[PDB]
Tab-separated table of C-alpha atoms in Angstrom:
chain	number	residue	atom	x	y	z
A	1	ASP	CA	102.949	9.650	100.703
A	2	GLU	CA	100.461	9.116	97.847
A	3	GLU	CA	102.705	6.734	95.848
A	4	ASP	CA	102.486	4.247	98.764
A	5	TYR	CA	98.750	3.733	98.429
A	6	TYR	CA	97.646	1.634	95.502
A	7	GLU	CA	94.083	1.258	94.282
A	8	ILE	CA	93.217	-2.318	95.327
A	9	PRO	CA	90.399	-3.204	92.873
B	1	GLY	CA	78.641	-8.286	123.735
B	2	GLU	CA	80.712	-5.162	124.137
B	3	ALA	CA	81.035	-2.371	126.647
B	4	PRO	CA	79.337	0.911	125.903
B	5	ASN	CA	81.739	3.500	124.638
B	6	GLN	CA	81.320	6.442	126.939
B	7	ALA	CA	84.155	8.529	125.569
B	8	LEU	CA	83.330	12.232	125.263
B	9	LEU	CA	83.250	14.020	121.941
B	10	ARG	CA	83.996	17.627	122.804
B	11	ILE	CA	82.608	20.417	120.615
B	12	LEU	CA	84.888	23.449	120.358
B	13	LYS	CA	84.014	27.049	119.322
B	14	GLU	CA	86.047	28.766	116.550
B	15	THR	CA	86.646	31.605	119.034
B	16	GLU	CA	88.381	29.219	121.477
B	17	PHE	CA	91.421	28.857	119.249
B	18	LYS	CA	93.618	31.010	117.063
B	19	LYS	CA	95.598	29.576	114.178
B	20	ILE	CA	99.176	30.782	114.182
B	21	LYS	CA	100.582	29.237	110.997
B	22	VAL	CA	100.085	26.604	108.322
B	23	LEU	CA	101.706	23.196	108.655
B	24	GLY	CA	100.451	21.796	105.382
B	25	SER	CA	98.048	22.394	102.530
B	26	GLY	CA	95.896	19.615	101.173
B	27	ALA	CA	93.146	19.002	98.678
B	28	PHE	CA	91.023	18.106	101.675
B	29	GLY	CA	91.919	21.286	103.480
B	30	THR	CA	94.571	23.203	105.336
B	31	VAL	CA	96.239	21.979	108.519
B	32	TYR	CA	97.148	24.753	110.914
B	33	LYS	CA	99.416	25.042	113.888
B	34	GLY	CA	97.530	27.012	116.538
B	35	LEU	CA	96.701	27.458	120.194
B	36	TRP	CA	93.541	26.215	121.915
B	37	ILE	CA	92.445	28.458	124.797
B	38	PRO	CA	89.433	26.840	126.454
B	39	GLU	CA	87.141	29.602	127.597
B	40	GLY	CA	87.902	30.896	131.070
B	41	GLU	CA	90.506	28.264	131.906
B	42	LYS	CA	93.597	30.435	131.792
B	43	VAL	CA	95.475	27.870	129.702
B	44	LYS	CA	96.775	27.756	126.095
B	45	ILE	CA	97.235	24.407	124.363
B	46	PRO	CA	99.382	23.732	121.288
B	47	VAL	CA	97.113	22.065	118.772
B	48	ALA	CA	97.111	20.999	115.154
B	49	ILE	CA	93.912	22.078	113.373
B	50	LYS	CA	92.466	20.560	110.164
B	51	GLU	CA	90.106	23.001	108.396
B	52	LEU	CA	88.484	21.111	105.559
B	53	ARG	CA	88.259	22.551	102.077
B	54	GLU	CA	85.325	24.820	101.371
B	55	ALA	CA	84.032	22.386	98.804
B	56	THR	CA	83.472	19.343	100.945
B	57	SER	CA	81.696	16.257	99.686
B	58	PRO	CA	79.204	14.437	101.952
B	59	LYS	CA	81.426	11.342	101.689
B	60	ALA	CA	84.601	13.171	102.763
B	61	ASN	CA	82.862	14.442	105.911
B	62	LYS	CA	81.207	11.118	106.750
B	63	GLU	CA	84.678	9.579	106.401
B	64	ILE	CA	86.452	12.199	108.487
B	65	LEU	CA	84.043	11.890	111.409
B	66	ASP	CA	84.805	8.196	111.636
B	67	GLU	CA	88.417	9.128	112.200
B	68	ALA	CA	87.338	11.581	114.914
B	69	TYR	CA	85.096	8.866	116.350
B	70	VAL	CA	88.127	6.620	116.796
B	71	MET	CA	90.660	9.264	117.918
B	72	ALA	CA	88.196	10.287	120.619
B	73	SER	CA	87.742	6.783	121.953
B	74	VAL	CA	91.430	6.326	122.620
B	75	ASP	CA	93.404	7.222	125.746
B	76	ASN	CA	97.066	6.202	125.782
B	77	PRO	CA	100.415	8.013	125.996
B	78	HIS	CA	101.475	6.553	122.632
B	79	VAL	CA	98.381	7.335	120.584
B	80	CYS	CA	97.434	10.755	119.286
B	81	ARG	CA	94.521	11.963	121.362
B	82	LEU	CA	91.961	14.177	119.718
B	83	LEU	CA	90.975	17.255	121.692
B	84	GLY	CA	87.717	18.000	119.915
B	85	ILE	CA	86.137	19.155	116.694
B	86	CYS	CA	84.686	22.420	115.497
B	87	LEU	CA	81.484	22.453	113.483
B	88	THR	CA	82.060	25.473	111.289
B	89	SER	CA	81.045	25.780	107.665
B	90	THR	CA	83.927	23.413	107.172
B	91	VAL	CA	84.489	20.978	110.001
B	92	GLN	CA	87.699	21.257	111.964
B	93	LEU	CA	89.450	18.280	113.562
B	94	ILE	CA	91.610	19.335	116.517
B	95	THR	CA	94.532	17.289	117.811
B	96	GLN	CA	97.541	17.746	120.081
B	97	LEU	CA	100.393	19.551	118.299
B	98	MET	CA	103.275	17.209	117.383
B	99	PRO	CA	106.013	19.779	116.759
B	100	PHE	CA	108.654	17.526	115.233
B	101	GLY	CA	106.127	16.168	112.743
B	102	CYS	CA	106.322	12.795	111.028
B	103	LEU	CA	108.696	10.219	112.524
B	104	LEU	CA	109.606	9.103	109.012
B	105	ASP	CA	110.690	12.633	108.072
B	106	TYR	CA	112.491	12.961	111.353
B	107	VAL	CA	114.698	9.933	110.842
B	108	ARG	CA	115.487	11.124	107.332
B	109	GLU	CA	116.522	14.594	108.496
B	110	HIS	CA	118.453	13.463	111.551
B	111	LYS	CA	119.899	10.096	110.705
B	112	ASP	CA	123.357	11.337	111.477
B	113	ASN	CA	122.217	12.390	114.923
B	114	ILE	CA	120.022	9.404	115.853
B	115	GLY	CA	121.327	6.769	118.254
B	116	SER	CA	120.429	3.200	119.189
B	117	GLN	CA	118.765	4.257	122.457
B	118	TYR	CA	116.285	6.440	120.602
B	119	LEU	CA	115.538	3.909	117.874
B	120	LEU	CA	114.892	1.092	120.318
B	121	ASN	CA	112.858	3.406	122.566
B	122	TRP	CA	110.670	4.286	119.585
B	123	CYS	CA	110.144	0.602	118.783
B	124	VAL	CA	108.966	0.090	122.350
B	125	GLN	CA	106.624	3.117	122.356
B	126	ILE	CA	104.955	2.094	119.102
B	127	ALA	CA	104.602	-1.439	120.480
B	128	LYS	CA	102.886	-0.027	123.585
B	129	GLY	CA	100.559	2.087	121.451
B	130	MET	CA	99.697	-0.871	119.223
B	131	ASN	CA	99.254	-3.085	122.265
B	132	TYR	CA	96.778	-0.628	123.665
B	133	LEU	CA	94.945	-0.718	120.398
B	134	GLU	CA	94.673	-4.476	120.760
B	135	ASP	CA	93.155	-4.141	124.219
B	136	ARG	CA	90.553	-1.811	122.668
B	137	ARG	CA	90.009	-4.498	120.026
B	138	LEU	CA	91.096	-1.936	117.422
B	139	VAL	CA	92.914	-2.696	114.184
B	140	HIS	CA	94.794	0.252	112.747
B	141	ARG	CA	95.149	-1.183	109.288
B	142	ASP	CA	97.716	1.391	108.229
B	143	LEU	CA	100.788	1.451	110.405
B	144	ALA	CA	103.880	2.984	108.931
B	145	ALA	CA	106.588	5.396	109.950
B	146	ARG	CA	104.583	8.023	108.016
B	147	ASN	CA	101.834	7.560	110.608
B	148	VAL	CA	103.801	8.018	113.809
B	149	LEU	CA	104.159	11.547	115.085
B	150	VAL	CA	106.993	13.022	117.140
B	151	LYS	CA	106.014	15.091	120.189
B	152	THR	CA	109.566	15.193	121.430
B	153	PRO	CA	112.461	13.122	120.077
B	154	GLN	CA	111.907	10.963	123.183
B	155	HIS	CA	108.111	10.627	122.808
B	156	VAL	CA	106.358	9.368	119.682
B	157	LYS	CA	102.649	8.599	119.094
B	158	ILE	CA	100.650	6.533	116.589
B	159	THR	CA	98.280	8.432	114.324
B	160	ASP	CA	96.182	8.467	111.145
B	161	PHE	CA	93.176	6.420	112.188
B	162	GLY	CA	91.249	6.968	108.994
B	163	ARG	CA	91.442	3.298	108.029
B	164	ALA	CA	91.002	1.920	111.550
B	165	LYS	CA	88.405	-0.753	112.241
B	166	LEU	CA	86.695	-2.152	115.312
B	167	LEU	CA	86.148	-5.836	116.012
B	168	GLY	CA	82.999	-7.300	117.489
B	169	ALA	CA	83.918	-9.264	120.574
B	170	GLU	CA	82.844	-12.300	118.621
B	171	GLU	CA	84.571	-10.904	115.534
B	172	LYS	CA	88.111	-12.134	114.859
B	173	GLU	CA	88.894	-10.939	111.329
B	174	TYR	CA	88.073	-7.899	109.244
B	175	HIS	CA	86.877	-8.091	105.687
B	176	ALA	CA	87.170	-5.062	103.517
B	177	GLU	CA	86.236	-3.806	100.074
B	178	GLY	CA	88.555	-2.189	97.586
B	179	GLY	CA	90.051	1.176	98.409
B	180	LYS	CA	93.509	2.634	98.020
B	181	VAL	CA	95.881	0.596	100.206
B	182	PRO	CA	99.556	0.599	101.428
B	183	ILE	CA	100.678	-2.567	99.656
B	184	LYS	CA	104.256	-2.453	100.839
B	185	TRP	CA	103.282	-2.448	104.541
B	186	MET	CA	100.551	-5.014	104.322
B	187	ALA	CA	100.449	-8.576	105.517
B	188	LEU	CA	100.186	-11.085	102.649
B	189	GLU	CA	96.854	-12.281	104.047
B	190	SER	CA	95.649	-8.698	103.628
B	191	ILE	CA	96.778	-8.279	100.053
B	192	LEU	CA	95.347	-11.601	98.919
B	193	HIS	CA	92.184	-11.681	100.964
B	194	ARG	CA	91.568	-8.243	102.309
B	195	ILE	CA	91.941	-9.717	105.756
B	196	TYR	CA	93.103	-7.667	108.702
B	197	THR	CA	93.977	-8.756	112.229
B	198	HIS	CA	95.902	-7.472	115.198
B	199	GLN	CA	98.544	-9.761	113.688
B	200	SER	CA	98.366	-8.070	110.266
B	201	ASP	CA	99.231	-4.946	112.238
B	202	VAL	CA	102.307	-6.719	113.639
B	203	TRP	CA	103.488	-7.366	110.091
B	204	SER	CA	103.159	-3.638	109.434
B	205	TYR	CA	104.980	-3.030	112.707
B	206	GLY	CA	107.828	-5.137	111.296
B	207	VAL	CA	107.982	-2.947	108.195
B	208	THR	CA	107.751	0.153	110.382
B	209	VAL	CA	110.781	-0.724	112.492
B	210	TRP	CA	112.577	-1.571	109.269
B	211	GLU	CA	111.844	1.966	108.082
B	212	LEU	CA	113.437	3.337	111.238
B	213	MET	CA	116.535	1.082	111.137
B	214	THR	CA	117.182	2.117	107.532
B	215	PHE	CA	116.641	5.784	108.462
B	216	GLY	CA	113.666	6.133	106.184
B	217	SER	CA	114.468	3.876	103.264
B	218	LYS	CA	111.538	2.816	101.085
B	219	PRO	CA	110.518	-0.850	101.529
B	220	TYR	CA	110.694	-2.911	98.358
B	221	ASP	CA	111.756	0.139	96.405
B	222	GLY	CA	112.439	-0.542	92.756
B	223	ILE	CA	109.822	-3.283	92.725
B	224	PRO	CA	106.167	-2.598	91.687
B	225	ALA	CA	103.355	-3.231	94.154
B	226	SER	CA	101.611	-5.615	91.739
B	227	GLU	CA	104.635	-7.902	92.279
B	228	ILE	CA	104.690	-7.870	96.114
B	229	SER	CA	102.159	-10.674	96.717
B	230	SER	CA	104.069	-13.120	94.482
B	231	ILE	CA	107.373	-12.191	96.092
B	232	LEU	CA	106.307	-12.809	99.688
B	233	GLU	CA	104.798	-16.093	98.517
B	234	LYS	CA	108.282	-17.057	97.315
B	235	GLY	CA	109.613	-16.245	100.790
B	236	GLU	CA	111.625	-13.137	99.849
B	237	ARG	CA	111.598	-10.494	102.625
B	238	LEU	CA	113.097	-7.052	103.343
B	239	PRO	CA	116.910	-7.124	103.763
B	240	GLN	CA	118.663	-6.755	107.164
B	241	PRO	CA	119.473	-3.117	107.951
B	242	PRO	CA	123.264	-2.503	108.219
B	243	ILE	CA	122.987	-1.273	111.821
B	244	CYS	CA	120.985	-4.355	112.759
B	245	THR	CA	122.227	-7.193	114.918
B	246	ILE	CA	120.638	-10.485	113.998
B	247	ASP	CA	118.678	-10.224	117.256
B	248	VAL	CA	116.703	-7.247	116.068
B	249	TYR	CA	116.414	-8.486	112.490
B	250	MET	CA	115.252	-11.870	113.740
B	251	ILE	CA	112.418	-10.044	115.401
B	252	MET	CA	111.384	-8.206	112.224
B	253	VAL	CA	111.490	-11.457	110.291
B	254	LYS	CA	109.093	-13.063	112.815
B	255	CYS	CA	106.581	-10.238	112.180
B	256	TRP	CA	106.621	-11.294	108.565
B	257	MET	CA	105.795	-14.942	109.108
B	258	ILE	CA	102.998	-16.304	106.966
B	259	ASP	CA	101.167	-18.177	109.704
B	260	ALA	CA	99.920	-14.995	111.357
B	261	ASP	CA	99.493	-16.841	114.669
B	262	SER	CA	103.236	-17.625	114.539
B	263	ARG	CA	104.042	-13.895	114.548
B	264	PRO	CA	104.830	-12.114	117.810
B	265	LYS	CA	102.264	-10.303	119.963
B	266	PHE	CA	102.633	-6.576	120.580
B	267	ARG	CA	103.037	-7.362	124.287
B	268	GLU	CA	105.918	-9.645	123.387
B	269	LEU	CA	107.454	-6.985	121.152
B	270	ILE	CA	107.154	-4.530	124.026
B	271	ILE	CA	109.170	-6.989	126.139
B	272	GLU	CA	111.812	-7.816	123.526
B	273	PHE	CA	112.628	-4.226	122.524
B	274	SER	CA	112.491	-3.169	126.122
B	275	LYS	CA	115.142	-5.771	127.014
B	276	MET	CA	117.201	-4.517	124.118
B	277	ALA	CA	116.688	-0.871	125.078
B	278	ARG	CA	118.537	-1.544	128.309
B	279	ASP	CA	121.694	-2.347	126.370
B	280	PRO	CA	121.252	-0.493	123.084
B	281	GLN	CA	124.783	-0.707	121.736
B	282	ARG	CA	124.643	-4.507	121.959
B	283	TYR	CA	121.692	-4.642	119.595
B	284	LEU	CA	122.236	-1.762	117.152
B	285	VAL	CA	125.682	-0.974	115.704
B	286	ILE	CA	125.783	2.702	114.612
B	287	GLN	CA	128.935	4.755	113.768
B	288	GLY	CA	129.329	7.464	116.451
B	289	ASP	CA	126.432	6.200	118.616
B	290	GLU	CA	128.049	6.997	121.972
B	291	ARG	CA	128.113	10.758	121.285
B	292	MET	CA	124.867	11.702	119.510
B	293	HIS	CA	122.681	14.448	120.979
B	294	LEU	CA	119.013	15.096	120.319
B	295	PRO	CA	116.717	17.860	121.614
B	296	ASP	CA	107.450	29.721	118.651
B	297	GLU	CA	105.811	32.519	120.623
B	298	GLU	CA	106.470	34.554	123.773
B	299	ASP	CA	102.917	33.929	124.949
B	300	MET	CA	104.423	30.766	126.361
B	301	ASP	CA	103.838	31.479	130.022
B	302	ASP	CA	100.457	29.806	130.232
B	303	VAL	CA	101.105	27.089	127.672
B	304	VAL	CA	100.329	23.540	128.738
B	305	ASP	CA	100.667	20.320	126.766
B	306	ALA	CA	97.485	18.488	125.830
B	307	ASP	CA	99.012	15.558	127.722
B	308	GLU	CA	98.709	17.578	130.916
B	309	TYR	CA	95.310	19.037	130.072
B	310	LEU	CA	92.781	16.563	131.449
B	311	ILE	CA	88.969	16.829	131.477
């Protein structure tokens, strides 16, 4: 699910 | 100094398969459930087909072929094999059909009907898959219950290799540059330093089993991902699932050690869960466990599973 992946920079 | 990779990338014709129905729709493209009928073989093979969106960027294709590159170089019962790809106007990735879909979704929909034997068996199968990946010096880098597929309720496979990386025989650690990442599954060493190891996969394994033992609960829900690094540094960890004997939970905890070398090895996990699988009701306490039971087209006569179709 998209809410699990956070933009790291 | 590494062995040559002599895996075969098979190129399929659009005529060789017919798409029955649509599993999902994505910005990237549409995933279809279909049959693959290799020409003049008198067999039909249940496949899942990605057909990428008509507007496809040169980055999105270069990225997708890497995933195909990996999925083609793998051969193990607990890893999704990739049958081939089709070079149409939009490229199509072709994998073995996993009818029961996502393992995460499956535990959520069936929690009432899922028993310790199955749960523990899953833990073992994933451990075997991950162990195989270690032999191939591969680091998945995104292991979660969302990325394990269910072929049958008794047979699950690891999937979603888009983030996977390969280690030079000399190479011991992977260093990465910013991209969207699954914070709540990641080792601390990964969040702080963008470092990935076979051991950082074990950490994610820990979280994965925790997803299963909570029947699909969301790890660190209610707390924002920006906070996670500081919280693990404090020593806080995911709580013990209700069904979990300390034996099992102990094992999860070990996956979440900070000295990554102190964490267990997939081969050891295979062993531990496998011992436990022998006596499931001693290691997972679930209400009603003893009685739970778990488990188209008429063109079915010639159908064969990809797992039995060997080239």
